[PDB]
Amino acid sequence: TIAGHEEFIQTSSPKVTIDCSAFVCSNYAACHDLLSEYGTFCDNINSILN
Amino acid sequence: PNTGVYDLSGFTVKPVATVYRRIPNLPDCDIDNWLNNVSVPSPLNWERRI
Ligand SMILES: *[C@@H]1O[C@H](CO)[C@@H](O[C@@H]2O[C@H](CO)[C@@H](O)[C@H](O)[C@H]2NC(C)=O)[C@H](O)[C@H]1NC(C)=O
Numbered sequence: 001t002i003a004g005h006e007e008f009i010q011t012s013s014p015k016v017t018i019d020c021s022a023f024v025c026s027n028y029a030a031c032h033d034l035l036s037e038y039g040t041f042c043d044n045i046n047s048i049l050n
Numbered sequence: 051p052n053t054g055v056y057d058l059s060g061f062t063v064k065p066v067a068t069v070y071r072r073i074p075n076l077p078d079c080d081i082d083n084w085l086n087n088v089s090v091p092s093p094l095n096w097e098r099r100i
Contacts, residue, residue, distance in 0.1 A: 019059070027062075046057075 020045050 020042030025031030035042075084099060091097040 017057070019057075021059070 017049060018045065 021032065021035060024042075025035045079099075081099070
């Protein structure tokens with residue numbers, strides 16, 4: 001006779017993007033002024049996710 | 051700058067409309083009832099409440 005079975009292979013994932021400053025320093029301006037002196041942190045996280 | 055899709059950030063500030071529920075205690079000593087009290091004092095029987 002002829003038997004049959006099926007298999008699944010995963011080829012992708014959901015594409016998560018993160019606003020780094022709104023995750024860290026949501027809306028308050030003192031937090032944004034403090035986060036500016038860390039420099040290239042949010043840009044490195046955005047670059048890796050891109 | 052180069053050609054591309056850039057994720058530029060937005061802005062909003064909301065200082066309006068504080069609502070402030072704050073669980074009131076025992077309400078008042080009710081001197082708005084005592085200055086308007088039905089027993090009106092005299093100088094001879096002047097009334098003091100602490
Ligand atoms: C105004 O003050 C008088 C007393 O200064 C209050 O009269 C008292 O009323 C309660 C209940 O009706 C009685 O148990 C007391 O004995 C009363 N006091 C006296 C001296 O008789 C009156 O209730 C107050 N009224 C308002 C609207 O605050």
